[PDB]
């Protein structure tokens, strides 16, 4: 994901925003973020 | 997690923020993130 992105999960609604990016990919309630 | 909580793997060193709390826990790289 990238600096700046804004992700969310669609079974919680959890959002958080990317502050340092990396290549792992965000996981919540074991499934993928979306980004936004 | 909480809001305003900040979150880093220690795989990626992908960082975030907790913009809205949700209860799912944030994974990255398939791993638990680590409560900065």
Same mark, same amino acid.
């Given at each position: 994901?990238? $600096? /700046?992105? %804004?992700?969310? +999960? &669609? =079974?919680? /609604?959890? %959002? %958080?925003? !990317? =502050? $340092? &990016? /990396? /290549?792992?990919? =965000? %996981?919540? +309630?074991? $499934?993928?973020? !979306?980004?936004?």
């Amino acid at each position: 994901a990238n $600096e /700046g992105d %804004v992700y969310k +999960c &669609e =079974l919680c /609604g959890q %959002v %958080v925003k !990317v =502050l $340092e &990016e /990396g /290549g792992g990919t =965000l %996981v919540c +309630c074991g $499934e993928d973020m !979306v980004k936004q």
